[PDB]
């Protein structure tokens, strides 16, 4: 271990990402969440349960990324500066996770929150995706680890991010949505960066190896995609929003794929997101 | 793994420290380091070299704490909130270390800097304490890892922090001193928190194990103490300040022990640091 020298950058992107991520630092306390209290009261009991469950699902994924994911990529960094950026990513995943408790504390009741957490421990689709990702994080295959990480950063949270964006388009939970956008602002960069590092590693492999990884990527995606469909149908049952969430899933699945350097897999007719959602996503 | 719940804190100190460290977030870019350029030219060749070398050493430690330290402590966390707090500590360690490149960048030449790093790779004492600490961080002794970290956080740093606080009292490099002060504000809580967690683990050990760990701590503190002596009287050789530095490190060695729940090791006579310096702290 040698002292790190930030005046001898080996890959400029490391410094760009470091500056963008650190400059985008934030904490949930900085978001006036209490201003969503009236909006929360206008949601149905069903909608409130849905929101809480979705957020607990998001929390599990962030907790994993903070605990196992990010730190898992550490031993695979190719530059000392990458290691520093990964430590920031890990910390921010902790802030992301913590933010949901801030939301629960401000808007919800202890009883209903505890029930949601119980639900998360038992939901098959949720535990299945958590299991799939973790298995890759504990393995010894660095590139399958980055593929899983990108799918988590750019795909797996979106069945959840969709809800606050929808509510916001109706003028509800807008401050919660603002917070979600700060989280998304981070995840988008995380996925971009990890995907970038994955691409660099590919060039150091043969053509036969790069081809294996490509096939692995598409198979893992289909596995996660189908399980996410089941996760979505169950959570959004009877809301009438299932097909919109699915479109949002394909939309983000293509971005995850592109972050790994591959071409979009889902055609426009499966990834046609309602412009209202796209607008709320980036006003 | 379960989703963390910050509305079910298992130890209030976890929330306290999380709020302290996150509220105290900062970046070097936020410090007017440039306003020290004029004051940096007043320094001599020896001083400048000393400062750059001192800062390089500190940089290696933060790099270690960032890569090996804090990370190795996560597997030993006893609450989910502690794991989150440790990830913040690891992150800020990267910020601390990055700060030095920010300082070298605003007040030095690639020539000088590249020299201090070359030195860093060879200096015996420096490479030794780094070897000692990493040895524990990689071991499977959770409590020894915490003793090590507390020594790194509350002792092995001040051997350098002395200098920036000296210039500060003399009115030189006051901005850089503000930066260092920010680092200290973090390091101080880190040593306290990890030492706090160390003590909770102790109460759960046998009486004989508590004794063994106590003696061990002292054995490690001295091994690092004498090696820091060689480091000090060698780096501050041609300065005549070595005396002050020796007084400062004994001051911090005792603080490091308090953080572990132990009594002072060096008598006040050996820990009487120049009040002016303690003022810059
Ligand atoms: Fe996240
Ligand atoms: Fe992320
Ligand atoms: Fe530090
Ligand atoms: Fe520290």
From Swiss-Prot, chain B:
Cofactor binding summary note: Binds 2 iron ions per subunit.
UniProt keyword Hydrolase present: no
Amino acids binding Fe cation 2: 93, 153, 187, 190
Cofactor(s) needed for function: Fe cation
Keywords: Deoxyribonucleotide synthesis, Iron, Metal-binding, Oxidoreductase
Positions bound to Fe cation 1: 62, 93, 96
One record GO biological process: deoxyribonucleotide biosynthetic process
GO cellular component terms given for this protein: ribonucleoside-diphosphate reductase complex
EC category: oxidoreductase
Protein EC: 1.17.4.1
InterPro entries noted in UniProt: Ferritin-like_SF (IPR009078), RNR-like (IPR012348), RNR_NrdF-like (IPR026494), RNR_small (IPR033909), RNR_small_AS (IPR030475), RNR_small_fam (IPR000358)
Catalytic site: 100
Catalyzed chemical reaction(s): a 2'-deoxyribonucleoside 5'-diphosphate + [thioredoxin]-disulfide + H2O = a ribonucleoside 5'-diphosphate + [thioredoxin]-dithiol
Molecular function as annotated in GO: metal ion binding; ribonucleoside-diphosphate reductase activity, thioredoxin disulfide as acceptor
Assembly with partners or alone: Tetramer of two alpha and two beta subunits.
Protein family membership: Belongs to the ribonucleoside diphosphate reductase small chain family.
Function per UniProt: Provides the precursors necessary for DNA synthesis. Catalyzes the biosynthesis of deoxyribonucleotides from the corresponding ribonucleotides. R2F contains the tyrosyl radical required for catalysis.
Name of the protein in its database record: Ribonucleoside-diphosphate reductase 2 subunit beta
């Amino acid at each position: 271990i040698s002292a790190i020298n930030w005046n001898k950058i080996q890959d400029d992107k490391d410094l760009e990402v470091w500056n963008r991520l650190t400059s985008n630092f934030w904490l949930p306390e900085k978001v006036p969440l209490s201003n969503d209290i009236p909006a929360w009261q206008t949601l149905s009991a069903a909608e409130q349960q849905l929101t809480i469950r979705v957020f607990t699902g998001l929390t599990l994924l962030d907790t994993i990324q903070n605990i196992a994911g990010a730190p898992s990529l550490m031993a695979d960094a190719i530059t000392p500066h990458e290691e520093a950026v990964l430590s920031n990513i890990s910390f921010m995943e902790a802030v992301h996770a913590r933010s949901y408790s801030s939301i629960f504390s401000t808007l919800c009741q202890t009883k209903e929150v505890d029930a949601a957490y119980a639900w998360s421990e038992e939901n098959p689709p949720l535990q299945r995706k958590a299991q799939i990702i973790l298995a890759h994080y504990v393995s010894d295959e660095p590139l399958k680890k980055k593929i899983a990480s990108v799918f988590l950063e750019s795909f797996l949270f979106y069945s959840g991010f969709w809800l606050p964006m929808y509510f916001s388009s109706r003028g509800k939970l807008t401050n919660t949505a603002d917070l979600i956008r700060l989280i998304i602002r981070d995840e988008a960069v995380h996925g971009y960066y990890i995907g970038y590092k994955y691409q660099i590693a590919l060039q150091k492999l043969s053509a036969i190896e790069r081809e294996e990884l490509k096939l692995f990527a598409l198979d893992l995606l289909m596995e996660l995609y189908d399980n996410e469909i089941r996760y979505t149908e169950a959570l959004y049952a009877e809301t009438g929003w299932v097909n919109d969430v699915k479109a949002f899933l394909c939309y983000n699945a293509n971005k995850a794929l592109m972050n790994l350097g591959y071409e979009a897999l889902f055609p426009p007719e499966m990834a046609d997101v309602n412009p209202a959602i796209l607008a709320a996503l980036s006003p």
